[PDB]
């Protein structure tokens, strides 16, 4: 059985996700339209909007708001791309191997992402990650806990209060394990599988950071990004 | 009568304008859509695109490309908003007191610009400038020469080679006067009128710079701008 303090954590995280993930994708029409690096303006607007959502979620994670502004920034700059990849699983479809967000205008395949600069060196492990993640059939409670665990990883560059961040992450990890054991039927190997996905994200973050440098170093491409994307994926230190 | 060297200048400037001002406004659909600071995303994309066009025109002005990179930047940062206001006259309509660029989606009135942050302190002198400019019934030759004279003003902050810039501007001014005298019937008071408009632009630039500081200082508004707008309207010095 799960305690009240562990339950209140789950309640806070599900509430946080429902407040920041818009299932209608209604705001997508406000982005620069997709062109089929023709896709870069639309996907830069998509990522920037998703960054704002990741900020909104993080602020609602118990304990995150108590960290210094510098620790809050260090965590977000390092984990933003990984949280984006995790939260994007909700629109991912096994039938099409694509992210579907409403109409055919907001359906993104592997080819749409190559038209944003990205290569198969990133897109092949990313699609393979999305399939493996979808196959886990995570309850929403597990999905939000994995995002919160990912965001509160103390082993990120720029992090100062490692102890406090580690104690917050340890507590989230305990909540997840206990949730899986008690509420997820036949989930004996699931916690191990979810932790492997966290390792997969570190590798996808590495490849993305490498590829990001390539477009950020070409001002004709970097000028197509948003000021928030530039700041969050930027190399600046607090 | 006008000389060959003066004619070649006119030919170069008209060619430059025809290569950088798209009369179809076909690219406007690629901007973040207008919302009726709801208008700020669309107008930021409009200004950024117009900045790229002003860069394209300036590079084709005889002598501009021979200036140092630092002088080229100093001129553009100081004059960009004034060139934008000048070139926008081509879409301006006396009948509607608005800039019309195709359909009703790309028709901007005084109210649309208030929805981009913003006030009548800028928009009332700007609309009054557009009306007075339209009333002059400038030939395209005069319009392109006024833009080139405006851009090559040596009395701009950051300018190093004042002498060379002044000699380029003096030569453009001579071309304009001689053009008006010989080719513009009943244009005896026109050159004086066009030079007054250049003074009006300095006042509109001042008010815009003041108002720009207001949105650039609020990160929730500044984040809606483009990296090119931020760099060009920015306070950074070479």
């Amino acid at each position: 059985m799960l305690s009240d303090e562990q339950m209140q954590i789950i309640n806070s995280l599900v509430e946080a996700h429902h407040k920041t993930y818009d299932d209608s994708y209604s705001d997508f029409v406000r982005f620069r339209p997709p062109v089929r690096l023709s896709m870069l303006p639309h996907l830069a607007d998509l990522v920037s909007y998703s960054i704002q959502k990741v900020i909104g979620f993080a602020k609602m994670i118990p304990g995150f708001r108590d960290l210094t502004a510098e620790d809050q920034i260090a965590l977000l700059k390092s984990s933003a791309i990984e949280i984006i990849m995790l939260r994007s699983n909700q629109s991912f479809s096994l039938e099409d191997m694509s992210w579907s967000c409403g109409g055919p205008d907001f359906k993104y395949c592997i080819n749409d992402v190559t038209k944003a600069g990205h290569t198969l060196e990133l897109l092949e492990p990313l699609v393979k990650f999305q399939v493996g993640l979808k196959k886990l059939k995570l309850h929403e409670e597990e999905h939000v806990l994995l995002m919160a665990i990912c965001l509160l990883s103390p082993d990120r560059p720029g992090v100062q209060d490692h102890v406090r961040i580690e104690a917050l992450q340890d507590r989230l990890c305990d909540v997840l394990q206990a949730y899986i054991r008690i509420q997820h039927p036949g989930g004996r190997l699931l916690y191990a599988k979810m932790i492997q996905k966290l390792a997969d994200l570190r590798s996808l973050n590495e490849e993305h950071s490498k590829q990001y440098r390539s477009l950020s170093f070409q001002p004709e491409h970097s000028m197509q990004l948003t000021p928030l994307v530039l700041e969050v994926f930027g190399s600046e230190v607090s | 009568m006008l000389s060959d060297e003066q004619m070649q200048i006119i030919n170069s400037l008209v060619e430059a304008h025809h290569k950088t001002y798209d009369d179809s406004y076909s690219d406007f659909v690629r901007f973040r859509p207008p919302v009726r600071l709801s208008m700020l995303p669309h107008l930021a994309d409009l200004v950024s695109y117009s900045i790229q066009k002003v860069i394209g025109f300036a590079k084709m002005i005889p002598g501009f490309r021979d200036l140092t990179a630092e002088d080229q930047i100093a001129l553009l940062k100081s004059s960009a908003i004034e060139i934008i206001m000048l070139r926008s006259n081509q879409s301006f309509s006396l009948e509607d007191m608005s800039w019309s660029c195709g359909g009703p989606d790309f028709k901007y009135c005084i109210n649309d610009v208030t929805k981009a942050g913003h006030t009548l302190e800028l928009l009332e002198p700007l609309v009054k400038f557009q009306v007075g400019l339209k009333k002059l019934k400038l030939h395209e030759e005069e319009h392109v020469l006024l833009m080139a004279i405006c851009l090559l003003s040596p009395d701009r902050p950051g300018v190093q080679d004042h002498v060379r810039i002044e000699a380029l501007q003096d030569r453009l001014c001579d071309v304009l006067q001689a053009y008006i005298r010989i080719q513009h019937p009943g244009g005896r008071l026109l050159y004086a009128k066009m030079i007054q408009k250049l003074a009006d632009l300095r006042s509109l630039n001042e008010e815009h710079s003041k108002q720009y500081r207001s949105l650039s200082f609020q990160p929730e508004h500044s984040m809606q701008l483009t990296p090119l707008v931020l760099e060009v309207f920015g306070s950074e010095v070479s």
Binding site: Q52, I55, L76, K77, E231, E236, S238 | -
Partner: peptide
């Protein structure tokens, strides 16, 4: 530094 981030992390 981190102008947008600092503002978004406020209230």
């Amino acid at each position: 530094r981190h102008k947008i981030l600092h503002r978004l992390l406020q209230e």
